[PDB]
Design a protein around this ligand. Structure first.
Ligand SMILES: Nc1ncnc2c1ncn2[C@@H]1O[C@H](COP(=O)(O)OP(=O)(O)O)[C@@H](O)[C@H]1O
Ligand SMILES: [Mg+2]
Lengths: 98, 49, 49, 150, 49, 49
C-alpha cells in the first residue's frame, strides 16, 4: 500500500528531478547582493554587467562547473549549494553581528 | 546510470573541496602561528602588569 | 545467464531465480534512516520503502 | 588606578542604583547590565571572561563588590573588540538586497535573534519598534547610527 | 524533518521573497492531511503572532 | 555504465589519497590550537591576576 502511494504520488520522480535538476535559481543582482560578501575583491568596484559579475563571483568561489548553470537572467544551482553558501555567508557576518 | 552520475558528481565535489582545503592549510598554519605568537606576547604583558 | 540471476534470501538462505530487471541495488548502511531521501546513493522503490 | 577618579565617583553612584541585595553589592548577572549602563559595550563573552567564566547558576548567586567591579570596568574600558559605525553599516548592507539604503525589519529581527550572541524576541522588538515604514523596511544607516549614538 | 520545519521554511520564504506561499497536504482519506493542517496553523499562530 | 564504474572506483581512491593527508593536517592543527589555547589561558589568568 505504501509502494502504491509512492508510485501514484510521483514521489521518486519528484526526488529525481531534485537530484538531476537545478532546483535553486537566483537572479544575477540578488546573487551579487547576497553573496558578494563572500568574495569582495572578485569584482572591480566600478559598474559591471550583473551576469558577468555573477560569473566572476562564481569563479572566485571556485564552484565546480557542474554544480551550476548560467541562464539569461538567473544562475541555477544544484540542491544544497545555496545552503552551503548561506552557511559561509552567516559565518562571515557573525563576527560583525556579534 | 543517472544515480551513478549523481554519486560521482558528489564524490568529485568532495575531492575538490578537500583539495581546496589542502591548499588553504598553509595560510591556516601561518595564521595559527601568528596568533599564538600574539598570545605569547599578551601573556608576557599581563604577567608584567 | 543474461536475463536471470540466482539470489539467496537473507531471511531464509533460500536460493531463488529472479529476473535481472527486478533486482534493485541497495544503499550502504551508512544511509540508514537518512532525513532527506534525495541524499540516498541508490534511489529506487526498494530504497525509498 | 589608571583611571580618572572623577568618573569613578559617578560609577559608585550608578553601581549603587542597582540596589537589590539591600547593600553595596550586586550579583554577577547584573554585572554586564551595569557595565552597559555606565556607557561601555561589553559582549556577553567579555562579561563572562571578566567574571572568570562562572556557571550559569553561579551567575545568579555570586556577587561583586564595587572594589571588584571597578577593575572589571577598567579592563573593558582599556581594551575592547568593539567595531564602529563605518563597519556596522557595511555589515547591515549584506541584507540590503536592493541598494536603496533599506533592509526589511523582519530580516533584521531574524538575524539578531538567530546569529551571533542571540537576543530575545522581546529585546529585538523593542529595537525595531519605531523604525517602521509603509514597507516594513528599516534604513540601516540611520538605525545603526541611532543605536550606536544612543 | 517536521511539519514545523516546512511551515517555518514557508514563512521565511514569504518574508524573504515577499512571494505568497502554499502548504498542500495531499493524500488518501485517513492519511493525515487534516492533522498536519492543524499543526501548520498551530505553528503559524505561535511563531507569527 | 561500466566506464562510469571505472571512473567511480578511480575517484574514490583519489579522494582517499587526500583524506589520508587531511588526517595528518587535522592532527597538526589540533596540536597547534592546543598550544595557542594554552597561551590564551595563561594570558587570561595573568590578566585576571
Ligand atoms: N500526525 C499525526 N499524529 C497522530 N495521529 C494522527 C496523525 N495524523 C493522523 N492521525 C490519526 O489518523 C486519523 C486520520 O487523520 P486525518 O488527518 O484526520 O485524515 P485526513 O487526512 O483524511 O483528514 C486522525 O484522526 C488521527 O487519529
Ligand atoms: Mg480531513
Amino acid at each position: 500500500l505504501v509502494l502504491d502511494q509512492l508510485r501514484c504520488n510521483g514521489v521518486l520522480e519528484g526526488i529525481r528531478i531534485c537530484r538531476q535538476g537545478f532546483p535553486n535559481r537566483v537572479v544575477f543582482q540578488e546573487f551579487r547582493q547576497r553573496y558578494e560578501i563572500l568574495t569582495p575583491n572578485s569584482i572591480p568596484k566600478g559598474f559591471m554587467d550583473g551576469k558577468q559579475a555573477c560569473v566572476l563571483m562564481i569563479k572566485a568561489l571556485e564552484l565546480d562547473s557542474n554544480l551550476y548553470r548560467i541562464g539569461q537572467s538567473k544562475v541555477f544551482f544544484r540542491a544544497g549549494v545555496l545552503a552551503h553558501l548561506e552557511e559561509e555567508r552567516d559565518l562571515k557576518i557573525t563576527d560583525v553581528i556579534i | 546510470l543517472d544515480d551513478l552520475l549523481v554519486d560521482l558528481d558528489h564524490q568529485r565535489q568532495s575531492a575538490c573541496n578537500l583539495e581546496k582545503k589542502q591548499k588553504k592549510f598553509d595560510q591556516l598554519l601561518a595564521e595559527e602561528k601568528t596568533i599564538s605568537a600574539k598570545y605569547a606576547e599578551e601573556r608576557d604583558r599581563a604577567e608584567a602588569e | 545467464v543474461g536475463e536471470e540471476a540466482i539470489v539467496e534470501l537473507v531471511e531464509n538462505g533460500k536460493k531463488v531465480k529472479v529476473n535481472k530487471d527486478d533486482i534493485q541495488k541497495m544503499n550502504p548502511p551508512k544511509f540508514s534512516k537518512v532525513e532527506d531521501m534525495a541524499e540516498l546513493t541508490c534511489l529506487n522503490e526498494a530504497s525509498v520503502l | 588606578c589608571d583611571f580618572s577618579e572623577e568618573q569613578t565617583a559617578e560609577f559608585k553612584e550608578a553601581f549603587q542604583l542597582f540596589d537589590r541585595t539591600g547593600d553595596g553589592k550586586i550579583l554577577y548577572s547584573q554585572c554586564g547590565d551595569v557595565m552597559r549602563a555606565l556607557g561601555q559595550n561589553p559582549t556577553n563573552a567579555e562579561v563572562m571572561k571578566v567574571l572568570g567564566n562562572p556557571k550559569s547558576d553561579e551567575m545568579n548567586l555570586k556577587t561583586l563588590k564595587f572594589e571588584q567591579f571597578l577593575p572589571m570596568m577598567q579592563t573593558i574600558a582599556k581594551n575592547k573588540d568593539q567595531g564602529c559605525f563605518e563597519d556596522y553599516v557595511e555589515g547591515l548592507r549584506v541584507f540590503d538586497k536592493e541598494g536603496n539604503g533599506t533592509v526589511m525589519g523582519a530580516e533584521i529581527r531574524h538575524v539578531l535573534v538567530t546569529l551571533g550572541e542571540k537576543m530575545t524576541e522581546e529585546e529585538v522588538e523593542q529595537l525595531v519598534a519605531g523604525h517602521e515604514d509603509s514597507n516594513g523596511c528599516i534604513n540601516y544607516e540611520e538605525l545603526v547610527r541611532m543605536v550606536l549614538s544612543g | 524533518p517536521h511539519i514545523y520545519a516546512i511551515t517555518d521554511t514557508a514563512y521565511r520564504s514569504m518574508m524573504q521573497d515577499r512571494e505568497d506561499q502554499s502548504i498542500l497536504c495531499t493524500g488518501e482519506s485517513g492519511a493525515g492531511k487534516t492533522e498536519n493542517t492543524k499543526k501548520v496553523i498551530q505553528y503559524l499562530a505561535y511563531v507569527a503572532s
